[PDB]
C-alpha cells in the first residue's frame, strides 16, 4: 500500500528491531510465505460439471500469455511479452477473499447456512484499455517499453 520496496523494507526492519528491543514488523521470507496464501493458485475448488476444454489442474499461478506459441522463426514471431492468470483461478481467489463479507452479509440478512449453500449468483464487471508510450528510466533505446493494454475485471 505504499510502493515500499524489499531492500527498503528489510533495512527499516533491522532498523526498528535493533532500535527498540522488540520485533515490530516481520522479516521478509516469513511475510512472503504468508503472502503465498493470497495470490491465485492456492485454494482447492471443484466444478460440476467439469469445465469444457480446461486443464483440470488447480494449483498453477502466474502463467505466460503466449499460450505455448511455437517459437519457430518462419511463422509469425512470438516476441510479444505478456503475463496473466488462469481466469477461473483469479476468480476463485477474489471470491475466497470476499468470503468474509458474504458470510457477514448472510449474518445480517439472518439467512440460514445449511440452506444457502447453492443458489448463489455473482455479477462480474470487466474492462480493457491500454496506456500509450509509457515512460521509463534507463531506456535511451527502444526496449518496447511503450505500449501496454491491461485487461481486468472487478
Amino acid at each position: 500500500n505504499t510502493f515500499l520496496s524489499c531492500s527498503q523494507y528489510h533495512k527499516m526492519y533491522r532498523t526498528v528491531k535493533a532500535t527498540s528491543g522488540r520485533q515490530i514488523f516481520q522479516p521478509l521470507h516469513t511475510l512472503r510465505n504468508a503472502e503465498k496464501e493470497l495470490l491465485p493458485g492456492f485454494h482447492q475448488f471443484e466444478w460440476q460439471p467439469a469445465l469444457k476444454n480446461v486443464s483440470t489442474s488447480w494449483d498453477v499461478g502466474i502463467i505466460d500469455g503466449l499460450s505455448g506459441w511455437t517459437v519457430s522463426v518462419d511463422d509469425v514471431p512470438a516476441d510479444t511479452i505478456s503475463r496473466r492468470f488462469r481466469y477461473d483461478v483469479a476468480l476463485v481467489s477474489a471470491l475466497k477473499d470476499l468470503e468474509e463479507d458474504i458470510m457477514e452479509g448472510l449474518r445480517e440478512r439472518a439467512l440460514d447456512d445449511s440452506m444457502c449453500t447453492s443458489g448463489f449468483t455473482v455479477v462480474v464487471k470487466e474492462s480493457c484499455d491500454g496506456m500509450g508510450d509509457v515512460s521509463e528510466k534507463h531506456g535511451s533505446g527502444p526496449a518496447v517499453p511503450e505500449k501496454a493494454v491491461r485487461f481486468s475485471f472487478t
Binding site: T15, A18, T19, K137
Partner: protein
C-alpha cells in the same frame, strides 16, 4: 600516459610525505553521487528553485554521523 607516469615516477614521494594515498580517494564523492541521482527522483520538490535546496537538505541529513549511529543500533 599520465596515471602510468604518476605511478611509476611519483608514488614513492607522496607515499613518503603525506602518510597515505588512497586514503585521500576522490572515490567517495563520485561514487556517492548516485545519491544525487536518486534523491532527484524520489524526494524532489519539484521545481529547480527548490529542487537543489531540498535535495541538499536530505543529502546532508543522510550524511551526518548521528543518524548513521542510530541506524547501526547495537550492530
Amino acid at each position: 600516459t599520465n596515471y602510468l607516469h604518476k605511478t611509476l615516477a611519483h608514488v614513492p614521494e607522496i607515499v613518503e610525505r603525506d602518510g597515505s594515498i588512497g586514503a585521500w580517494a576522490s572515490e567517495g564523492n563520485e561514487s556517492g553521487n548516485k545519491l544525487f541521482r536518486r534523491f532527484r527522483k524520489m524526494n524532489a520538490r519539484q521545481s529547480k528553485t527548490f529542487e537543489l535546496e531540498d535535495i541538499l537538505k536530505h543529502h546532508w541529513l543522510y550524511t551526518s554521523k548521528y543518524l548513521q549511529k542510530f541506524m547501526e543500533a547495537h550492530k
